[PDB]
Design an enzyme around this catalytic site. Structure first.
Site, PDB file in Angstrom:
ATOM      1  N   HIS A  27      55.755  -5.480  31.529  1.00 55.71           N
ATOM      2  CA  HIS A  27      55.700  -4.484  32.685  1.00 55.71           C
ATOM      3  C   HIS A  27      55.767  -4.806  34.319  1.00 55.71           C
ATOM      4  O   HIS A  27      56.668  -4.103  34.933  1.00 55.71           O
ATOM      5  CB  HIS A  27      54.315  -3.836  32.533  1.00 55.71           C
ATOM      6  CG  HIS A  27      54.072  -2.626  33.535  1.00 55.71           C
ATOM      7  ND1 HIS A  27      54.501  -1.470  33.412  1.00 55.71           N
ATOM      8  CD2 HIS A  27      53.506  -2.888  34.954  1.00 55.71           C
ATOM      9  CE1 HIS A  27      53.972  -0.837  34.540  1.00 55.71           C
ATOM     10  NE2 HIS A  27      53.615  -1.389  35.325  1.00 55.71           N
ATOM     11  N   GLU A  28      55.000  -5.963  34.443  1.00 54.62           N
ATOM     12  CA  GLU A  28      55.194  -6.454  35.618  1.00 54.62           C
ATOM     13  C   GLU A  28      56.613  -7.197  36.113  1.00 54.62           C
ATOM     14  O   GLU A  28      57.103  -6.905  37.297  1.00 54.62           O
ATOM     15  CB  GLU A  28      54.233  -7.525  36.119  1.00 54.62           C
ATOM     16  CG  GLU A  28      52.699  -7.177  35.889  1.00 54.62           C
ATOM     17  CD  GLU A  28      52.478  -5.995  36.864  1.00 54.62           C
ATOM     18  OE1 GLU A  28      51.641  -4.971  36.511  1.00 54.62           O
ATOM     19  OE2 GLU A  28      53.115  -5.648  37.950  1.00 54.62           O
ATOM     20  N   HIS A  57      58.724  -4.748  37.432  1.00 50.76           N
ATOM     21  CA  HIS A  57      58.742  -4.682  39.028  1.00 50.76           C
ATOM     22  C   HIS A  57      59.783  -5.670  39.770  1.00 50.76           C
ATOM     23  O   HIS A  57      60.132  -5.598  40.892  1.00 50.76           O
ATOM     24  CB  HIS A  57      57.252  -4.855  39.269  1.00 50.76           C
ATOM     25  CG  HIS A  57      56.285  -3.363  39.395  1.00 50.76           C
ATOM     26  ND1 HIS A  57      57.145  -2.458  39.991  1.00 50.76           N
ATOM     27  CD2 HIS A  57      55.442  -3.265  38.516  1.00 50.76           C
ATOM     28  CE1 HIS A  57      56.046  -1.268  39.692  1.00 50.76           C
ATOM     29  NE2 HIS A  57      55.002  -1.797  38.715  1.00 50.76           N
ATOM     30  N   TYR A  72      51.378   6.724  32.440  1.00 50.70           N
ATOM     31  CA  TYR A  72      51.257   5.627  33.363  1.00 50.70           C
ATOM     32  C   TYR A  72      52.773   5.785  34.407  1.00 50.70           C
ATOM     33  O   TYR A  72      52.552   5.664  35.560  1.00 50.70           O
ATOM     34  CB  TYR A  72      51.137   4.293  32.895  1.00 50.70           C
ATOM     35  CG  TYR A  72      51.059   3.108  33.739  1.00 50.70           C
ATOM     36  CD1 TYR A  72      50.704   3.238  34.991  1.00 50.70           C
ATOM     37  CD2 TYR A  72      51.215   1.905  33.243  1.00 50.70           C
ATOM     38  CE1 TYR A  72      50.347   1.993  35.974  1.00 50.70           C
ATOM     39  CE2 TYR A  72      51.171   0.620  34.057  1.00 50.70           C
ATOM     40  CZ  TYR A  72      50.733   0.766  35.167  1.00 50.70           C
ATOM     41  OH  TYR A  72      50.785  -0.336  35.976  1.00 50.70           O
ATOM     42  N   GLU A 120      56.436   2.613  38.990  1.00 51.17           N
ATOM     43  CA  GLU A 120      55.677   2.482  37.740  1.00 51.17           C
ATOM     44  C   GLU A 120      56.710   3.006  36.605  1.00 51.17           C
ATOM     45  O   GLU A 120      56.609   2.729  35.613  1.00 51.17           O
ATOM     46  CB  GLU A 120      54.439   3.518  37.771  1.00 51.17           C
ATOM     47  CG  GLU A 120      53.347   2.827  38.926  1.00 51.17           C
ATOM     48  CD  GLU A 120      53.255   1.374  38.820  1.00 51.17           C
ATOM     49  OE1 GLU A 120      52.927   0.925  37.804  1.00 51.17           O
ATOM     50  OE2 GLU A 120      53.177   0.920  40.037  1.00 51.17           O
TER      51      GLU A 120
HETATM   52 ZN    ZN Z   1      53.070  -1.333  37.522  1.00 51.62          ZN
END
Ligand code: ZN
Ligand code: ZN
EC number: 3.4.24.83
Lengths: 736, 725
Positions: free
Chosen positions: B638-639, B642, B680, B687
């Site tokens: 998930h990161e 980013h 989320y 996100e």
């Molecule tokens: Zn995040």
């Protein structure tokens, strides 16, 4: 049994723990010591033996004994009962701490006459008890502290001067348990002194004369309670817990082997309730009900708990795999009520507790009712073996309990909050206040040896069984007791176990009949008091005690308190007229500890079984009765009085409506006038009050007659129309 | 040295529990028995002595002994080790069960020769061990059961034939805790049997030959593990507990008597944190600060916790998504309880960490420095040898993700075996950055505490004594995990963790060597320079070793699910800015890759994961449970999303902006599908982008498909972003 093998018992102790080691012909020196230690409670000596202690009787310099040969120089420097200095080298008595303790007494006959030497020997024994024995069971604790504070705060400082050292006499505040932890030696000595003064014949009067509370504490402790200390000491030993368990098991050995497969099965389901099976519930539904279920908004009902809602939502799935719009539909509400009864677990014990033993109570479906009855009667026949035996003098069994079963209202504020290991003294004192007797309508499951509790169990019951009490054995070292047991509460105190505080409840099993007559007598007594105060005809039956569970005496005593507040916060004429209206319809104020669906004032007027309600309170128009459930906690309430006044609100509602004319069968809150008022101020009070006009009215009434005048002002500055509407009715009733 | 306190010790036991009642050859008879009992581990004899057991060597009919005088006729019927019947009046051994256990042995000089009779005696002693001794501490239990099951499910049924009765072989499934509870005699029997074959020298090979697992278990048990059995047995005894307590109390007596009022005050607040006072907080607002607080949507922000919402909501009754939610960030720092141990655990011992205001930071440093000086005396003493201390712990302190499923959903007295095996897998070492508060003698646990630590201190471990039977140990403790098993206590199951204290430096060295090892592996797999520092283990707490080992697993899933070239490109970019993949067990606001780049202290963020553009680093906090993500692998991926969002943006203007998600040419895409995935991702474009990226590389192809038919645009957009190469 009595002084029969009792005197044979004490002689067994002296046998093992007392060693007469002298050279001046042991014969008269022994009898002397026997007469000396004889004034000491036999149990103190038995506990010492259990702690590995030994009493040595020798002449000469006691400091030269084998046992004392290792003492530090600082220890040989000691003080006497009066605080005077002295040296062991030239003293006559010494109690050696350590976990191989010994009590060395210098042989002599002076003890008979010299009451100053005797007093000191008992002082040292008092140190043994307080420091070496009771410490092993976390005592002394809060109970003794209260005694110290009663003296420390007494008017006549004679008690302080007789027992307190200068440090204690100078403590700026009451002695807390914290003080007890860091100054144990000081508390231990005050205990020993008091004990000494009580044991020594001549000084006892001196104690009762200047330290009454210390005398009372020691009198009751030595004559009674000390047997409990011994019992608790034994309960900490691995081998004594095992021996006790083995003897009870052996006693029920024949009974255990005679159990049939059916019998065993009955005890198991009693211990483990039967959850409802998803499928069985579904097949029992009609096509119309399946459709109603799979499309019903479960998480929108207030009649269902979380478990139930979760259970239903799961059934809802099984069916599927094969601002407005929020309230349940017309029949969705009825359907859920009916479904509620079918999803309850099959719990024998819960059935007994909810009905208080009235197993024929029509609160559940006839088929389930009959099966419960069958198992109950079969379990009763199964439990025919009384505990009596030729293996134990007195039998104590234990029970960890959630205070919420007794009073969820006090249960909410029992634990400190800042420190979970502690209990709040204010809630504790209130809990204990009127707790004199208890009743078990269901089968108590108890531990042979005390065991650790779960987070929500802060009650620790120590129960003295009657030899006639019937019971059954369970392999995990537990016993199931017969239903319908009476319990007399002997003592309620805060104790410490595994560094956590608990409420110890000492109870003695007695015939339940003895407790029922006490309830009956109170019912008659409370009616005579209120018929008079309310000006009702003599012999009027207004108040009913439907009491059958574990907090019995409190349900009874709080009713007096509840009605006292009721009369204090409400206008006499309003109370008379409304009450007289209830009486004219043979109504009742019902105080109980069994669920409301099992009270006739409710169930004899229900159309269907599922149309039942269980809550803190309830007003039944058809029977003009107020029902108040004790153990539960009402919403937005902090008192049972508030709960009762709330319900009286409903009765006032009813009577005002009734006075309107010879028909209406509603409430003054059903008036177009109030409805409009509700639509406007409906949500300015409690959330529970926003439910409907009836509830809003009742809540408003309750708040307007709150012991706290501030709460009453709130209604006038938040619901002006309502404040005036209520007072308009009251006057309407009073002026009628 | 070794046998200096052993031989003399064992003889003291033989002295107390061995009564020789024979004719007059009391010399050869006594010596024979001694040789016999010799083969038995000394600890069993000491444990027997502890439960009041006695041993009698006699001549003739053993049932004619006083001890077995009251024996019921039924019990005179016995079955030997092989299952064959025998009459006690004709037998040579018998172990009487009961609160006054006794062992009777018929004296013989050929026990060495007649191995079948010696085997039977050891079998009876093995019965005393399982039925009379171990049962007092709720054993045997799960550990032994595993051995049984490994025997009945072994390729060859040799072991079964040798140790199992018919009742056991006929079992259709594996032996569960339920079976053991209703077949205790059977389990206790197999145990005794295994014990016997292992003790009888001539029979040891047979056991090892047909029942390997049984041999290994008994080998490790009688050679060391039994020592812990004795320790636990002693921990049940009132007098043993108080004797241990008293020696430790004596050792610390001078330390205790010299304590000042201030010293005592520190030890107190260390045990009980100080919650913030309303009157204190309110008085710090006053002007506009009170005004702002006055009308704010409390239960809105996701920056506060339940306990924090109530306190705040309570501040209102005592008197937003803009620059006012910033006011909550500042306030959040001001409402934390003054908790020394929590501060040490959050910072991993780095007390100078700029994660809280200067005033409180300094207050904590002073208290901590003062406590470090107070705890100067080590436990080492001449009054005792090996000391064990105890600690009950909430598993959520180690791993809240496993902690969510540790307890059986239906029966809370049971532990889910699946989560147990996961929790135990890489648990080899642990570190205490705060002050461990341990019990001298073991005590009952709270409901949320299912871990029961039994810790072997080092004579060098420094500690403070408390009046309630506990010790406060020095901070910076190192621990090696020796054993982890499921046990039963008071009707509930628990996790017993046997750990040994070692110098913390020894554990830091293991972590350091692991950091170099993992970087060597990925520098090679990623084509990066030989000695680049990409991966860093910022490990300071009790589940230390798991943080380290799961790093390998997390990166493997990271590689195996994402295009090798996307990975290489993005990481080369991170390394170019000297970024890091930080795996840690201290809170994110204390890492550095985050705090050195914060403009304000209150701008700190703590959570399962975090990506900091300025430092080009990905931070992953192991202990917590993602409020959304299911595991750590997903948390990481998930990161990384980013990170991709950061690089892609960089490849559009290497001299301005930074995030492609921040482009107005993406916001719109977020206006349509932004609410078509996880809630989320619904938060915002960053996100959403990160979430969409994660799903597309999921291990569950189903997950991959959803974004396709639920977010067709994004799935095509992202695949176009990965295109930039
Ligand atoms: Zn995040
Ligand atoms: Zn109501």
């Amino acid at each position: 049994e009595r002084n029969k093998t009792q005197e044979e018992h004490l002689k067994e102790i002296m046998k093992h723990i007392v060693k007469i080691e002298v050279k001046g012909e042991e014969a008269v020196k022994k009898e002397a010591a026997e007469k000396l230690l004889e004034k000491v409670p036999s149990d103190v000596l038995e506990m010492y033996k259990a702690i590995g202690g030994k009493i040595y009787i020798v002449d000469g310099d006691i400091t030269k004994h084998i046992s004392l040969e290792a003492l530090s120089e600082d220890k040989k420097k000691i003080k006497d009962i009066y605080g005077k200095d002295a040296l062991l080298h030239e003293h006559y008595v010494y109690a050696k701490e350590g976990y191989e303790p010994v009590l060395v007494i210098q042989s002599s006959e002076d003890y008979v006459e010299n009451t100053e030497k005797a007093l000191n020997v008992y002082y040292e024994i008092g140190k043994i008890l307080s420091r070496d024995i009771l410490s092993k069971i976390n005592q002394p604790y809060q109970k003794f502290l209260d005694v110290l504070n009663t003296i420390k705060n007494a008017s006549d400082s004679d008690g302080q001067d007789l027992l307190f050292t200068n440090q204690l006499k100078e403590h700026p505040t009451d002695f807390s348990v914290e003080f007890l932890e860091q100054n144990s030696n000081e508390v231990q000595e005050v205990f020993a002194k008091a004990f000494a003064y009580y044991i020594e014949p001549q000084h006892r009067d001196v104690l009762q004369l200047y330290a009454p509370e210390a005398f009372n504490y020691m009198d009751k402790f030595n004559e009674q309670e000390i047997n409990l200390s011994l019992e608790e000491l034994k309960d900490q030993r691995m081998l004594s817990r095992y021996e006790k368990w083995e003897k009870i098991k052996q006693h029920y050995q024949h009974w255990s082997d005679s159990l049939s497969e059916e019998g065993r099965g009955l005890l198991k389901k009693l211990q483990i309730p039967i959850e409802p099976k998803k499928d069985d519930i579904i097949h029992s539904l009609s096509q119309e009900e399946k459709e109603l279920l799979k499309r019903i908004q479960i998480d929108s009902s207030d009649f269902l708990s979380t478990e139930e809602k979760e259970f239903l939502k799961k059934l809802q799935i099984d069916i599927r795999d094969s601002d407005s719009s929020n309230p349940l539909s017309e029949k969705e509400k009825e359907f859920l009520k009916k479904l509620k009864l079918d999803i309850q677990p099959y719990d024998i014990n819960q059935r007994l507790q909810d009905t208080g033993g009235l197993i024929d109570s029509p609160s559940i479906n006839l088929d389930v009712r009959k099966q419960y009855k069958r198992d109950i009667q079969n379990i009763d026949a199964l439990l025919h073996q009384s505990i009596g035996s030729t293996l134990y003098n007195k039998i104590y069994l234990y029970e960890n309990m959630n205070i919420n079963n007794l009073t969820a209202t006090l249960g909410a504020d029992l634990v400190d909050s800042t420190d979970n290991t502690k209990i709040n003294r204010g809630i504790f004192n209130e809990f204990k206040k009127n707790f004199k007797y208890s009743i078990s309508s269901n089968y108590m499951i108890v531990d042979i040896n005390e065991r650790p509790a779960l987070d929500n169990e802060r009650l620790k019951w120590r129960i003295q069984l009657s030899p006639d009490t019937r019971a059954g054995y369970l392999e995990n070292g537990k016993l199931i007791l017969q239903r319908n047991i009476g319990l007399e509460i002997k003592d309620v105190q805060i104790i410490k176990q595994s560094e956590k505080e608990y409420i110890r409840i000492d109870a003695k099993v007695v015939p339940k009949s003895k407790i029922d007559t006490k309830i009956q007598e109170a019912q008659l007594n409370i009616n005579q008091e209120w018929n008079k105060a309310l000006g009702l005809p003599k012999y009027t039956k207004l108040i009913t005690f439907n009491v059958h569970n574990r907090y019995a005496s409190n349900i009874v005593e709080s009713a007096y308190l509840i009605l006292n507040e009721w009369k204090n916060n409400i206008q006499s004429d309003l109370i008379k007229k409304v009450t007289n209206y209830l009486v004219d319809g043979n109504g009742r104020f019902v105080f109980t500890d069994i669920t409301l669906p099992n009270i006739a004032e409710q169930y004899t007027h229900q159309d269907e079984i599922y149309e039942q309600v269980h809550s803190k309170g309830l007003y039944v128009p058809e029977s003009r009765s107020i029902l108040l459930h004790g153990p539960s906690k009402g919403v937005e309430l902090r008192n049972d009085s508030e709960g009762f006044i709330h319900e009286f609100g409903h009765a006032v509602d009813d009577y005002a409506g009734y006075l309107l004319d010879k028909n209406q069968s509603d409430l003054v809150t059903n008036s177009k006038k109030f409805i409009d008022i509700f639509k406007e101020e409906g949500s300015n009070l409690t959330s529970y009050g926003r439910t409907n006009e009836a509830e809003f009215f009742a809540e408003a009434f309750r708040l307007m007659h709150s012991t706290d005048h501030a709460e009453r002002l709130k209604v006038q500055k938040n619901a002006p129309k309502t404040f005036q509407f209520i007072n308009d009715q009251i006057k309407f009733i009073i002026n009628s």
